[PDB]
Design a protein around this nucleic acid. Structure first.
Ligand SMILES: [K+]
Ligand SMILES: [K+]
Ligand SMILES: [K+]
Ligand SMILES: [K+]
Ligand SMILES: [Mg+2]
Ligand SMILES: [Mg+2]
Ligand SMILES: [Mg+2]
Ligand SMILES: [Mg+2]
Ligand SMILES: [Mg+2]
Ligand SMILES: [Mg+2]
Ligand SMILES: [Mg+2]
Ligand SMILES: [Mg+2]
Ligand SMILES: [Mg+2]
Ligand SMILES: [Mg+2]
Ligand SMILES: [Mg+2]
Ligand SMILES: [Mg+2]
Ligand SMILES: [Mg+2]
Ligand SMILES: [Mg+2]
Ligand SMILES: [Mg+2]
Ligand SMILES: [Mg+2]
Ligand SMILES: [Mg+2]
Ligand SMILES: [Mg+2]
Ligand SMILES: [Mg+2]
Ligand SMILES: [Mg+2]
Ligand SMILES: [Mg+2]
Ligand SMILES: [Mg+2]
Ligand SMILES: [Mg+2]
Ligand SMILES: [Mg+2]
Ligand SMILES: [Mg+2]
Ligand SMILES: [Mg+2]
Ligand SMILES: [Mg+2]
Ligand SMILES: [Mg+2]
Ligand SMILES: [Mg+2]
Ligand SMILES: [Mg+2]
Ligand SMILES: [Mg+2]
Ligand SMILES: [Mg+2]
Ligand SMILES: [Mg+2]
Ligand SMILES: [Mg+2]
Ligand SMILES: [Mg+2]
Ligand SMILES: [Mg+2]
Ligand SMILES: [Mg+2]
Ligand SMILES: [Mg+2]
Ligand SMILES: [Mg+2]
Ligand SMILES: [Mg+2]
Ligand SMILES: [Mg+2]
Ligand SMILES: [Mg+2]
Ligand SMILES: [Mg+2]
Ligand SMILES: [Mg+2]
Ligand SMILES: [Mg+2]
Ligand SMILES: [Mg+2]
Ligand SMILES: [Mg+2]
Lengths: 88, 101, 119, 73
RNA sequence: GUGGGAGAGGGUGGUGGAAUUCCCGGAGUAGCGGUGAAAUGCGCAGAUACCGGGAGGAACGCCGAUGGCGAAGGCAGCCACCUGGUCCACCCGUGACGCUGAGGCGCGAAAGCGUGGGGAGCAAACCGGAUUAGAUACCCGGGUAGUCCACGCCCUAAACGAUGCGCGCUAGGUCUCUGGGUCUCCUGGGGGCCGAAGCUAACGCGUUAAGCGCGCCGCCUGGGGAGUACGGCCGCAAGGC
């Protein structure tokens, strides 16, 4: 699964400031972690479609948040994509 | 690293040497998979509700342990190789749910 | 000629026939009877009176082996089960215990079209 | 209407998740090895739901029966 | 986000008992089976019924419900692992990041197709027995594809609440699942019943709207011809849109 220590590690690693737990960067980082874990779960167990739908929904949510960041502050958008290595 | 409980029902007709050998193999297999034991309750021979392996009784052993999850199944298989061992059930530990309290 | 003197009595009752098998305490049969052992040939075997005749016939055959007490075991729902019960109960054979042990599955096999709308 | 007695009311403090306690789970079975309904046990939905799986565990371990035979018919 | 919660939600591996069939042995004898009544069938190469042992396939009795979960199809032994959704409490973080959604993409009961395997029970076609005026049926004895598994296709349905999704507003009572709380009760989410206003052609709906409103998509324009023809796209085919 995704234990609390890993979640706090990534939250503190992507927090805009001490105490931030819900900024766009933190949400995108957490969604990316969950997406990578689910993709590793879906390489094996490729017959699991109900979880594949959740993967699709997480990808859509991350895309919408990244689009919002693109609209508002493209600098933090580029920095987030550089740190996480997304968009190929 | 999760906490589990292991129920092992084996042949009640074993003598003390054969029972010691079976428990030795059980302990060695627990060490081979990194299963830290917290307590043990040896109930021993008890009357079954239905014949298991053509025997109306069975020798019961119970181990509360803590081990990595990824190999739990892989451990249970190792405990089913012995012919004297006839029942192996591993259950994730749960807090007691009391009723009529 | 074994002189068992005590055994079991299995009653297999269906909507088409009732058949009684008298066995030893280990289950090995000694004598038996049914609706066909009596003169009844067709549907008259699925009759409580035919079941009574079959039970009494098997009991009298068990008298030849000198049996006194029996343990009755009932399997299957069929017209004539209780009549065979009452036939064995007062037949000279002492009935020690009546037990219904009808084999009911845990939904394993698919029934015929006759028994469908269930599982 | 099952006005004889409730299994819960005829009992004290016990763990519903203990699959090894046989003498207490025997009371929750019928004359056959079947699990008693809600009207007989007097448990709640959650209580009965936990009791079912614990009874199944006790059956698999060989402590409780899967099915018994009816007597005195 | 933090902390809790319920669940047949999904995938993989393992595992349990009842029963059916088959095989082996014991014991045992003249029929069993089946129907409105019968016959085919099976049985002296010993059946049925009974006991014990073994094999195999498939489905999970009680729990179990008017219950739960899921977007739908749909999901029911048990254990473990992997995994999706969801609810509540705290009022903590971001600061309109929202709703819908033509196309596109993916999932999609059963039946059906391909390759390989499996095959106990059931069972289209088919072989028979009856019934009947006839019986290409209903009833009875058999029985292949199939049902099962892996992988790949197929895209249908009374795929039904015959009710698209989201948000707000508008009496309550009662039953229930699941949380939280000052736990007679209140509050939140979900499943039912009865009903205010109101709506409806009526039946009925009525805080789970079919009421009052707003946003967006889909669809209808008399019946037969006809979901047919042609064209296109898709499919190995059946055929689908
Ligand atoms: K339901
Ligand atoms: K074939
Ligand atoms: K339609
Ligand atoms: K409460
Ligand atoms: Mg073994
Ligand atoms: Mg008959
Ligand atoms: Mg599930
Ligand atoms: Mg034989
Ligand atoms: Mg036959
Ligand atoms: Mg035959
Ligand atoms: Mg013949
Ligand atoms: Mg002969
Ligand atoms: Mg047979
Ligand atoms: Mg047998
Ligand atoms: Mg075979
Ligand atoms: Mg039920
Ligand atoms: Mg639901
Ligand atoms: Mg449905
Ligand atoms: Mg605030
Ligand atoms: Mg602010
Ligand atoms: Mg949407
Ligand atoms: Mg679309
Ligand atoms: Mg389909
Ligand atoms: Mg299919
Ligand atoms: Mg096929
Ligand atoms: Mg094939
Ligand atoms: Mg058949
Ligand atoms: Mg015919
Ligand atoms: Mg006619
Ligand atoms: Mg004729
Ligand atoms: Mg047929
Ligand atoms: Mg065959
Ligand atoms: Mg074919
Ligand atoms: Mg419907
Ligand atoms: Mg609809
Ligand atoms: Mg219409
Ligand atoms: Mg609606
Ligand atoms: Mg409600
Ligand atoms: Mg109403
Ligand atoms: Mg009115
Ligand atoms: Mg009216
Ligand atoms: Mg509404
Ligand atoms: Mg028209
Ligand atoms: Mg016209
Ligand atoms: Mg038309
Ligand atoms: Mg059509
Ligand atoms: Mg065309
Ligand atoms: Mg073509
Ligand atoms: Mg055709
Ligand atoms: Mg055709
Ligand atoms: Mg067509």
């Amino acid at each position: 699964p995704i234990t609390k220590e890993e979640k706090q590690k990534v939250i503190q690693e992507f927090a805009r400031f001490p105490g931030d737990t819900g900024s766009t960067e933190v949400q995108v980082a957490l969604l990316t972690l969950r997406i990578n874990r689910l993709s590793e779960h879906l390489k094996v167990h490729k017959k699991d479609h109900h979880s594949h739908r959740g993967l699709l929904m997480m990808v859509g949510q991350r895309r919408r948040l990244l689009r919002y960041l693109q609209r508002e502050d493209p600098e933090r958008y580029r920095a987030l994509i550089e740190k996480l290595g997304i968009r190929g | 690293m999760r906490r589990y409980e292991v129920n092992i029902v084996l042949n009640p007709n074993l003598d003390q040497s054969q029972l010691a050998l079976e428990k030795e193999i059980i302990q060695r297999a627990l060490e081979n998979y990194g299963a830290r034991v917290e307590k043990v309750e040896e109930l021993g021979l008890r009357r079954l509700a239905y014949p298991i392996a053509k025997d109306p009784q069975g020798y019961f052993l119970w181990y509360q342990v803590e081990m990595p999850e990824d190999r739990v199944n892989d451990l249970a298989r190792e405990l089913r190789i012995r012919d004297n061992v006839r029942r192996v059930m591993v259950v994730k530990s749960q807090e007691p749910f009391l009723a009529n309290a | 000629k074994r002189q068992v003197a005590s055994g079991r009595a299995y009653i297999h009752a269906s909507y088409n026939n009732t058949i009684v098998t008298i066995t030893d305490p280990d289950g090995n049969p000694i004598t038996w009877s049914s609706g066909g052992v009596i003169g009844y040939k067709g549907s008259r075997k699925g009759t409580p009176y035919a079941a009574q005749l079959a039970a009494l016939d098997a009991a009298k055959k068990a008298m030849a082996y000198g049996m006194q007490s029996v343990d009755v075991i009932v399997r299957g729902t069929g017209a004539g089960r209780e009549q065979a019960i009452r036939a064995l109960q007062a037949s000279g054979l002492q009935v020690k215990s009546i037990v219904d042990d009808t084999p009911v599955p845990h939904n394993g096999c698919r029934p015929k079209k006759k028994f469908r709308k269930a599982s | 209407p099952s006005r004889k007695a409730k299994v819960k009311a005829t009992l004290g403090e016990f763990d519903l998740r203990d699959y090894r306690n046989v003498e207490v789970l025997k009371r929750f079975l019928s004359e056959t090895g079947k699990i008693l309904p809600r009207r007989r046990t007097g448990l709640s939905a959650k209580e009965q739901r936990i009791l079912a799986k614990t009874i199944k565990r006790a059956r698999i371990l060989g402590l409780l029966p899967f099915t018994e035979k009816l007597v005195r018919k």
